[PDB]
Amino acid sequence: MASMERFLSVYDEVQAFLLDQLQSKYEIDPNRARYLRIMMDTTCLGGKYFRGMTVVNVAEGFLAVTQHDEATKERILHDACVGGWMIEFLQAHYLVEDDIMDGSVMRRGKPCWYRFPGVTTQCAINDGIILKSWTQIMAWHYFADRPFLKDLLCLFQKVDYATAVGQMYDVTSMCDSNKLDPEVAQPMTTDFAEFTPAIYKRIVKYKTTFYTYLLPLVMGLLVSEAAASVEMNLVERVAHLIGEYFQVQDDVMDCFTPPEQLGKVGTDIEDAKCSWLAVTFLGKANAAQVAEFKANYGEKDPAKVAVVKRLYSKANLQADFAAYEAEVVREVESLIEQLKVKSPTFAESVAVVWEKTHKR
Amino acid sequence: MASMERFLSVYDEVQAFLLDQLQSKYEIDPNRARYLRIMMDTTCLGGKYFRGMTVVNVAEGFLAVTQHDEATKERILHDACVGGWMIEFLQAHYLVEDDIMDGSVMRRGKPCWYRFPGVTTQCAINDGIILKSWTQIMAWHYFADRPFLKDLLCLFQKVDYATAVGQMYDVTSMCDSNKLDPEVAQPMTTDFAEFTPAIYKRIVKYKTTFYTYLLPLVMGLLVSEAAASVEMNLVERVAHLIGEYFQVQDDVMDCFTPPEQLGKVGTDIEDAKCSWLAVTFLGKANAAQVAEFKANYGEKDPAKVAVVKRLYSKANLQADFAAYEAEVVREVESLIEQLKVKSPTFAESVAVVWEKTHKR
């Protein structure tokens, strides 16, 4: 059975389990089940399933080198699919809530969930809660007796919390830290002192890298009972590095990729986001450029957003990006090599994770 | 040491642990730690701590009859305090998110969190996420090696998910079920066919009773290693019954308790909530009363809200409430007695839970 068809089939299985349980145990009526079914589909499906399929790919790597009964290979692959769905649903939680937080319009060429006519924010906040609750219901049902259950739950928990901390870093990235105060409405930074590579790295490490790269790799290790084939400090290091590169790419696309192919009108500039473009631009700009950036960034006025795009175009940020890309290629190659000392197989899965990221 | 001082001290301990960990492990800066400290205080403190203190009270009941070393009594009480905080923080998550969902103004005489000037919805949604994440970080830290950890995490998980399902039942309670549809904006019911005692019971069972009464009782059993002193079907039954009565009281207060003592301008009528008052009124009204109710319910216009209050006043809902109260007293007394077959002690804690509810 091909990996993706397996993964998509387990989606159906898991959906039926969750909805059946709501009927048999939570007194749900068919109409509200249908609402939840549709919500699950609309929020969990239609992506590339990069995160969930990474769990499956890591598990298949180990299966190719490890002795097991056929029934055991099937159980491992079924666990890797369930685990991959837990990550997809965790992502779905964060996208639903983030889209509401940010007042986003579209995602992936379709309206954000909360904008659907029969949803609204009042329902969608809670729908997003349920999405994450489902990840736990999946875990406790399908992995009840599994030896990795504790480690899996503890890992998921930490990754979720890292993610929420990252969200906080992201939403507060255009404030001056010394001005944060629940009692006082927050002004936009005027000095941009906090738009540094290190501050940037912190936002991205927490907001994206733990759930997008660390969790799918480590979950693949856990459902394979293979966390001893690796040095976990190396898996963290490579996860954080690849994940940073992924976000840098997303940041550049927000600005320069056409909306119909982006899936989204990009608003990082209007939103005054600490993007890789802003940070890199400030890291090379002269006094005049810095002042022009300050007078135009974080404003909805299209003339001003086009002044910022003009500044980024003239500043030859392609050069800084090629240089960044080259260094990331060095370091990820170095880490893959360190990963071979303990597991060729696992190192190869990380290679494939890297190729899928670097090429897209 | 008195129970409450113990409980409040462990709040400080737990806060310091969470914030210290954010500094040492999540790269937080002091300003954002301060923001989180303030958020935690503002959202978790200032109530009566009924839920968390119930965990402590149940544990103290068992301590009085069970042989242990002093260090063991201290550890049990410290676990009951930590567990009680997990429930308080779970409540805080749900109040923050609910207040945003419902567009609420105040809670407990103070603005809802999201309305604070330096918070806003964008931050508050995520602050509420973090509140719940903290419950897990507490559990995994303080109970890492405890024999009840699995059962505690599995119980908490189920109670959380019940709660979210209850929220969904609540927010959709004024829609016609057969009209729920993410694609179509939802009209208010015109027939009120779904304003029944059984539908009401379902909303309340899930939205409030699992986290308010079932979880504090069962958590007290778990940190005491005493879940064998009880018949768990009886603990569920009594939890759901008491919790229903609690909500009935809250529903009546929303309408009739003065705002400065309610802590809140009540808006159940404008919000077209399936309240105990609406359901009970519809259960005794004549044709003319039903039609007048329909023409005025779920409208912001103060003249119409006062027409609904007029209808409830004239309908002698005090009588139906005394009758309800009397039956709840019967059944809760019957359940407490069934609870004595296996645990006098546990039955007495449920008695105290009931007195604190019935009198307030």
Ligand SMILES: Nc1ccccc1N1CCOCC1
């Ligand atoms: N049979 C066996 C025994 C002990 C370890 C590994 C294996 N295999 C190597 C060939 O392909 C995977 C199974």
Ligand SMILES: Nc1ccccc1N1CCOCC1
């Ligand atoms: N949050 C997380 C998830 C998975 C692995 C490790 C972590 N942490 C790294 C930094 O904070 C302490 C532990």
Ligand SMILES: Nc1ccccc1N1CCOCC1
């Ligand atoms: N000492 C003892 C032995 C076996 C069971 C219970 C007890 N106690 C009864 C008196 O108060 C609580 C401790």
Ligand SMILES: Nc1ccccc1N1CCOCC1
């Ligand atoms: N959600 C929950 C929490 C604590 C105990 C039991 C439950 N459930 C009762 C009905 O649904 C199945 C299990």
Ligand SMILES: [Zn+2]
């Ligand atoms: Zn966002």
Ligand SMILES: [Zn+2]
């Ligand atoms: Zn982006």
Ligand SMILES: [Zn+2]
């Ligand atoms: Zn509400």
Ligand SMILES: [Zn+2]
């Ligand atoms: Zn109320």
